[PDB]
mmCIF file of C-alpha atoms in Angstrom:
data_model
loop_
_atom_site.group_PDB
_atom_site.id
_atom_site.type_symbol
_atom_site.label_atom_id
_atom_site.label_comp_id
_atom_site.label_asym_id
_atom_site.label_seq_id
_atom_site.Cartn_x
_atom_site.Cartn_y
_atom_site.Cartn_z
ATOM 1 C CA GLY H 23 60.944 106.782 105.992
ATOM 2 C CA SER H 24 59.399 104.529 108.717
ATOM 3 C CA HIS H 25 60.008 104.667 112.583
ATOM 4 C CA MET H 26 58.798 101.201 113.665
ATOM 5 C CA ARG H 27 58.866 100.793 117.524
ATOM 6 C CA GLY H 28 57.617 97.994 119.740
ATOM 7 C CA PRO H 29 56.251 94.510 118.999
ATOM 8 C CA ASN H 30 54.218 93.443 115.970
ATOM 9 C CA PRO H 31 50.649 94.509 116.965
ATOM 10 C CA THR H 32 47.583 92.239 117.540
ATOM 11 C CA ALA H 33 43.911 93.079 118.073
ATOM 12 C CA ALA H 34 44.581 91.932 121.724
ATOM 13 C CA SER H 35 47.743 94.127 122.276
ATOM 14 C CA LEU H 36 45.874 97.267 120.915
ATOM 15 C CA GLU H 37 42.592 96.601 122.876
ATOM 16 C CA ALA H 38 44.541 96.235 126.167
ATOM 17 C CA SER H 39 44.427 99.098 128.670
ATOM 18 C CA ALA H 40 48.320 99.378 128.352
ATOM 19 C CA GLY H 41 50.728 99.013 125.413
ATOM 20 C CA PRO H 42 54.246 97.550 125.736
ATOM 21 C CA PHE H 43 56.064 100.629 127.195
ATOM 22 C CA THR H 44 56.243 101.921 130.797
ATOM 23 C CA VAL H 45 54.673 105.429 131.273
ATOM 24 C CA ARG H 46 55.685 108.224 133.569
ATOM 25 C CA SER H 47 54.318 111.798 133.637
ATOM 26 C CA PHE H 48 54.973 115.313 134.983
ATOM 27 C CA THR H 49 53.201 118.643 135.255
ATOM 28 C CA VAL H 50 54.689 121.470 133.045
ATOM 29 C CA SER H 51 56.245 124.080 135.418
ATOM 30 C CA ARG H 52 55.852 127.228 133.266
ATOM 31 C CA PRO H 53 53.360 126.540 130.406
ATOM 32 C CA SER H 54 54.204 128.701 127.391
ATOM 33 C CA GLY H 55 51.106 129.969 125.497
ATOM 34 C CA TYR H 56 48.494 127.652 127.165
ATOM 35 C CA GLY H 57 46.961 127.220 130.689
ATOM 36 C CA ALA H 58 48.537 124.052 132.154
ATOM 37 C CA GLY H 59 49.859 120.664 130.866
ATOM 38 C CA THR H 60 50.644 117.077 131.870
ATOM 39 C CA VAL H 61 53.318 115.288 129.802
ATOM 40 C CA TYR H 62 53.006 111.495 129.466
ATOM 41 C CA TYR H 63 56.071 109.690 128.087
ATOM 42 C CA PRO H 64 57.486 106.142 127.540
ATOM 43 C CA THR H 65 60.597 105.344 129.675
ATOM 44 C CA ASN H 66 61.674 102.505 127.371
ATOM 45 C CA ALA H 67 60.426 103.083 123.775
ATOM 46 C CA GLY H 68 63.956 102.315 122.371
ATOM 47 C CA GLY H 69 63.909 105.333 120.011
ATOM 48 C CA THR H 70 62.650 108.878 119.679
ATOM 49 C CA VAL H 71 58.796 109.028 119.477
ATOM 50 C CA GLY H 72 56.354 111.527 117.998
ATOM 51 C CA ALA H 73 54.481 114.061 120.156
ATOM 52 C CA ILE H 74 50.638 114.421 120.378
ATOM 53 C CA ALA H 75 48.864 117.480 121.913
ATOM 54 C CA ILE H 76 45.307 116.911 123.256
ATOM 55 C CA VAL H 77 42.831 119.797 124.010
ATOM 56 C CA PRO H 78 39.455 119.648 125.963
ATOM 57 C CA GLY H 79 36.059 121.101 124.994
ATOM 58 C CA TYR H 80 34.352 124.290 126.228
ATOM 59 C CA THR H 81 34.277 124.503 130.131
ATOM 60 C CA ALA H 82 36.384 121.284 130.213
ATOM 61 C CA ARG H 83 39.785 120.405 131.675
ATOM 62 C CA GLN H 84 42.527 117.800 131.227
ATOM 63 C CA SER H 85 40.321 115.242 133.168
ATOM 64 C CA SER H 86 37.898 114.934 130.150
ATOM 65 C CA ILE H 87 40.762 113.710 127.808
ATOM 66 C CA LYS H 88 43.451 112.427 130.193
ATOM 67 C CA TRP H 89 42.794 108.657 129.495
ATOM 68 C CA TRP H 90 44.574 109.196 126.087
ATOM 69 C CA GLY H 91 47.865 110.180 127.840
ATOM 70 C CA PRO H 92 48.915 106.768 129.228
ATOM 71 C CA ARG H 93 47.006 104.805 126.494
ATOM 72 C CA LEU H 94 48.969 106.470 123.572
ATOM 73 C CA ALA H 95 52.276 107.016 125.581
ATOM 74 C CA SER H 96 52.407 103.203 126.422
ATOM 75 C CA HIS H 97 52.572 102.518 122.609
ATOM 76 C CA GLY H 98 55.473 104.967 121.922
ATOM 77 C CA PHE H 99 54.380 108.620 121.974
ATOM 78 C CA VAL H 100 54.952 111.737 124.114
ATOM 79 C CA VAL H 101 51.415 113.070 124.888
ATOM 80 C CA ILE H 102 50.637 116.452 126.332
ATOM 81 C CA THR H 103 47.056 117.028 127.731
ATOM 82 C CA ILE H 104 46.402 120.749 128.226
ATOM 83 C CA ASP H 105 44.117 123.129 130.054
ATOM 84 C CA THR H 106 43.403 126.239 127.931
ATOM 85 C CA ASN H 107 44.219 129.782 129.121
ATOM 86 C CA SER H 108 40.365 130.057 129.719
ATOM 87 C CA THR H 109 37.799 127.247 129.831
ATOM 88 C CA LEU H 110 35.729 129.516 127.486
ATOM 89 C CA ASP H 111 38.342 129.718 124.670
ATOM 90 C CA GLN H 112 36.916 129.164 121.098
ATOM 91 C CA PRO H 113 38.373 126.757 118.475
ATOM 92 C CA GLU H 114 40.921 129.210 116.899
ATOM 93 C CA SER H 115 42.467 129.989 120.372
ATOM 94 C CA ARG H 116 42.383 126.218 121.226
ATOM 95 C CA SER H 117 44.327 125.477 117.962
ATOM 96 C CA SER H 118 47.012 128.171 118.831
ATOM 97 C CA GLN H 119 47.352 126.701 122.352
ATOM 98 C CA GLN H 120 47.526 123.135 120.989
ATOM 99 C CA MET H 121 50.423 124.188 118.695
ATOM 100 C CA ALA H 122 52.042 126.099 121.617
ATOM 101 C CA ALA H 123 51.977 122.788 123.716
ATOM 102 C CA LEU H 124 53.737 120.977 120.782
ATOM 103 C CA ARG H 125 56.294 123.816 120.612
ATOM 104 C CA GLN H 126 57.010 123.456 124.390
ATOM 105 C CA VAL H 127 57.283 119.615 124.037
ATOM 106 C CA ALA H 128 60.004 120.366 121.369
ATOM 107 C CA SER H 129 61.672 122.844 123.851
ATOM 108 C CA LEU H 130 61.632 120.317 126.757
ATOM 109 C CA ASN H 131 63.101 117.660 124.322
ATOM 110 C CA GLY H 132 66.109 120.007 124.110
ATOM 111 C CA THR H 133 66.203 120.602 127.972
ATOM 112 C CA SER H 134 68.689 118.349 129.936
ATOM 113 C CA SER H 135 66.695 118.810 133.205
ATOM 114 C CA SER H 136 63.470 117.503 131.525
ATOM 115 C CA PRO H 137 62.275 113.900 131.875
ATOM 116 C CA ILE H 138 61.658 113.978 128.025
ATOM 117 C CA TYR H 139 65.211 115.190 127.119
ATOM 118 C CA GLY H 140 66.059 113.480 123.805
ATOM 119 C CA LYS H 141 62.830 111.273 123.911
ATOM 120 C CA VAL H 142 60.999 113.240 121.065
ATOM 121 C CA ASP H 143 61.268 113.228 117.228
ATOM 122 C CA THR H 144 60.172 116.915 116.871
ATOM 123 C CA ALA H 145 59.609 116.177 113.121
ATOM 124 C CA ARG H 146 56.569 113.790 113.947
ATOM 125 C CA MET H 147 53.577 115.433 115.506
ATOM 126 C CA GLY H 148 49.875 114.775 116.040
ATOM 127 C CA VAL H 149 46.752 116.569 117.326
ATOM 128 C CA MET H 150 43.697 115.381 119.180
ATOM 129 C CA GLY H 151 40.875 116.935 121.205
ATOM 130 C CA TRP H 152 37.139 116.986 122.161
ATOM 131 C CA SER H 153 34.429 119.179 120.681
ATOM 132 C CA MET H 154 35.845 122.740 120.398
ATOM 133 C CA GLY H 155 39.257 121.099 121.096
ATOM 134 C CA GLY H 156 38.437 118.698 118.164
ATOM 135 C CA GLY H 157 37.620 121.716 115.909
ATOM 136 C CA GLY H 158 40.870 123.211 117.097
ATOM 137 C CA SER H 159 42.761 120.036 116.089
ATOM 138 C CA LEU H 160 41.238 120.313 112.480
ATOM 139 C CA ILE H 161 42.303 124.061 112.400
ATOM 140 C CA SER H 162 45.802 122.927 113.610
ATOM 141 C CA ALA H 163 45.810 120.400 110.707
ATOM 142 C CA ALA H 164 44.566 122.998 108.115
ATOM 143 C CA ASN H 165 47.269 125.532 109.256
ATOM 144 C CA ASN H 166 50.225 123.035 109.689
ATOM 145 C CA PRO H 167 50.041 120.322 106.926
ATOM 146 C CA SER H 168 53.376 118.805 108.211
ATOM 147 C CA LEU H 169 51.427 117.342 111.128
ATOM 148 C CA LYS H 170 51.404 113.579 110.532
ATOM 149 C CA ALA H 171 47.943 112.754 111.998
ATOM 150 C CA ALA H 172 44.740 114.283 113.501
ATOM 151 C CA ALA H 173 42.116 112.235 115.630
ATOM 152 C CA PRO H 174 39.554 114.658 117.125
ATOM 153 C CA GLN H 175 36.517 113.410 119.042
ATOM 154 C CA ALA H 176 32.927 114.753 118.613
ATOM 155 C CA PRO H 177 34.410 117.808 116.803
ATOM 156 C CA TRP H 178 32.668 121.141 116.573
ATOM 157 C CA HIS H 179 33.720 124.302 114.641
ATOM 158 C CA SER H 180 31.671 127.365 113.486
ATOM 159 C CA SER H 181 32.554 126.154 109.879
ATOM 160 C CA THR H 182 32.437 122.472 108.652
ATOM 161 C CA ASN H 183 34.644 123.301 105.631
ATOM 162 C CA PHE H 184 38.048 121.506 106.179
ATOM 163 C CA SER H 185 38.521 120.954 102.397
ATOM 164 C CA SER H 186 42.226 122.009 102.516
ATOM 165 C CA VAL H 187 43.258 119.368 105.062
ATOM 166 C CA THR H 188 45.912 116.887 103.727
ATOM 167 C CA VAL H 189 46.702 115.430 107.251
ATOM 168 C CA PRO H 190 45.432 111.858 107.805
ATOM 169 C CA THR H 191 42.267 112.436 109.941
ATOM 170 C CA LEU H 192 40.286 110.029 112.141
ATOM 171 C CA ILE H 193 36.994 111.547 113.447
ATOM 172 C CA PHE H 194 35.388 109.876 116.522
ATOM 173 C CA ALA H 195 31.723 110.638 116.473
ATOM 174 C CA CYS H 196 29.003 109.981 119.053
ATOM 175 C CA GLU H 197 25.706 108.715 117.451
ATOM 176 C CA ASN H 198 23.311 110.516 119.904
ATOM 177 C CA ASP H 199 25.421 113.724 120.423
ATOM 178 C CA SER H 200 22.971 116.528 121.154
ATOM 179 C CA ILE H 201 25.719 119.182 121.814
ATOM 180 C CA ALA H 202 27.574 118.886 118.363
ATOM 181 C CA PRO H 203 25.120 116.712 116.464
ATOM 182 C CA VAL H 204 26.795 114.297 114.008
ATOM 183 C CA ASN H 205 24.424 115.414 111.159
ATOM 184 C CA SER H 206 25.474 119.124 111.525
ATOM 185 C CA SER H 207 29.098 118.747 112.880
ATOM 186 C CA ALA H 208 31.141 115.494 112.702
ATOM 187 C CA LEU H 209 29.822 114.169 109.340
ATOM 188 C CA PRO H 210 29.787 117.489 107.295
ATOM 189 C CA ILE H 211 33.392 118.006 108.588
ATOM 190 C CA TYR H 212 34.236 114.441 107.462
ATOM 191 C CA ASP H 213 32.579 115.027 104.075
ATOM 192 C CA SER H 214 34.491 118.341 103.409
ATOM 193 C CA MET H 215 37.888 116.568 103.262
ATOM 194 C CA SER H 216 38.746 115.223 99.775
ATOM 195 C CA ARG H 217 42.578 115.423 99.903
ATOM 196 C CA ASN H 218 43.523 113.114 102.811
ATOM 197 C CA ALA H 219 43.507 109.639 104.282
ATOM 198 C CA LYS H 220 40.461 109.963 106.559
ATOM 199 C CA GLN H 221 38.141 107.814 108.722
ATOM 200 C CA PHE H 222 34.802 108.317 110.531
ATOM 201 C CA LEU H 223 34.007 106.044 113.515
ATOM 202 C CA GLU H 224 30.603 106.658 115.158
ATOM 203 C CA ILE H 225 29.898 105.107 118.641
ATOM 204 C CA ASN H 226 26.464 103.339 118.763
ATOM 205 C CA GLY H 227 24.128 105.340 121.142
ATOM 206 C CA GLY H 228 27.020 107.634 122.170
ATOM 207 C CA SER H 229 26.445 110.933 124.007
ATOM 208 C CA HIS H 230 28.776 113.934 123.422
ATOM 209 C CA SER H 231 31.287 112.484 125.991
ATOM 210 C CA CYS H 232 31.435 108.967 124.342
ATOM 211 C CA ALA H 233 35.350 109.096 123.794
ATOM 212 C CA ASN H 234 36.168 110.908 127.076
ATOM 213 C CA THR H 235 37.860 109.647 130.242
ATOM 214 C CA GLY H 236 35.433 107.018 131.774
ATOM 215 C CA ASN H 237 33.918 105.889 128.471
ATOM 216 C CA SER H 238 32.883 102.186 128.242
ATOM 217 C CA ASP H 239 34.528 101.594 124.795
ATOM 218 C CA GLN H 240 38.279 102.240 125.653
ATOM 219 C CA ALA H 241 39.205 98.809 124.075
ATOM 220 C CA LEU H 242 37.825 99.800 120.676
ATOM 221 C CA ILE H 243 38.451 103.579 120.749
ATOM 222 C CA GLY H 244 41.959 103.117 122.196
ATOM 223 C CA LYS H 245 42.773 100.427 119.513
ATOM 224 C CA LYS H 246 41.649 102.787 116.677
ATOM 225 C CA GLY H 247 43.430 105.872 118.117
ATOM 226 C CA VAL H 248 46.714 104.109 118.650
ATOM 227 C CA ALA H 249 46.583 102.282 115.262
ATOM 228 C CA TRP H 250 45.900 105.581 113.424
ATOM 229 C CA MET H 251 48.716 107.355 115.213
ATOM 230 C CA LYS H 252 51.178 104.387 114.692
ATOM 231 C CA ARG H 253 50.226 104.141 111.003
ATOM 232 C CA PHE H 254 50.444 107.827 110.164
ATOM 233 C CA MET H 255 52.892 109.336 112.711
ATOM 234 C CA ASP H 256 55.382 106.458 112.411
ATOM 235 C CA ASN H 257 54.572 105.430 108.799
ATOM 236 C CA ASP H 258 54.438 101.927 110.382
ATOM 237 C CA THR H 259 52.665 99.756 107.707
ATOM 238 C CA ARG H 260 52.278 96.970 110.365
ATOM 239 C CA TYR H 261 49.285 99.077 111.407
ATOM 240 C CA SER H 262 47.695 99.540 107.994
ATOM 241 C CA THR H 263 44.952 96.913 108.645
ATOM 242 C CA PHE H 264 44.180 98.120 112.214
ATOM 243 C CA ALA H 265 44.062 101.821 111.050
ATOM 244 C CA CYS H 266 42.051 101.311 107.854
ATOM 245 C CA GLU H 267 39.779 98.267 108.676
ATOM 246 C CA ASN H 268 36.093 98.405 109.578
ATOM 247 C CA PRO H 269 36.492 97.090 113.198
ATOM 248 C CA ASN H 270 33.246 95.000 112.815
ATOM 249 C CA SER H 271 31.780 95.866 116.266
ATOM 250 C CA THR H 272 28.150 96.178 117.407
ATOM 251 C CA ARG H 273 29.468 99.277 119.393
ATOM 252 C CA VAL H 274 29.987 101.097 115.928
ATOM 253 C CA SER H 275 26.804 102.613 114.445
ATOM 254 C CA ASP H 276 28.666 104.021 111.326
ATOM 255 C CA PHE H 277 32.067 103.533 109.677
ATOM 256 C CA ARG H 278 33.536 105.516 106.638
ATOM 257 C CA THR H 279 37.109 105.607 105.398
ATOM 258 C CA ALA H 280 38.927 106.984 102.226
ATOM 259 C CA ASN H 281 42.581 106.894 100.907
ATOM 260 C CA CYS H 282 43.298 104.289 103.636
ATOM 261 C CA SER H 283 44.907 101.140 102.094
ATOM 262 C CA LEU H 284 45.043 97.791 103.973
#
């Protein structure tokens, strides 16, 4: 069961600002169970694509995470970036809202007026987000083991115990994070997970915002996010090396992976 779309990947094609597909976007008119959303979609993927829902951190909005929308969509995904009902929502609420966004993407896939009408494989879904939105993504993964992939950034949750998670999980960490320190947040979360394909990618000298819109490492972070989603959401074994490899970069202060075959 593989859903291979687009050309055979290269380090160069994955590091580029844009993948092979053309991207359009729209604002969701009547968000159902979350604050606001922007839907990014490929116009020319040549098949139905998985959907990814991305949630910001505490006080934050779509702007903090929006760079992911076109970057992932241009490689063959429908991506929804959300605002939460309140900027002060906690991780459980962020998880519910993330899953509501995926539910509404599935709804719009069935809506003839929608730009994403018949563009989505509602069986193939993924979750991403920053800090409390990253914690929320891991809660979404724990509660919904049918999700194909999770790739949270600088995650925080009130508990680091994600031992039940079977969903392939890529944690982006920021070496010098002083909001959700790696030693008390990202790494204990990574270490809790014994049942899944998982990866830990720490950005050298990174602050808490090291994977956000306007980061200086979009070539590397974008390559790893896309490769992880292509490998696990599409079961596209063309991406096994890109997903599972140590990227061998002086921008990476720490790399860990498990159950991830090249």
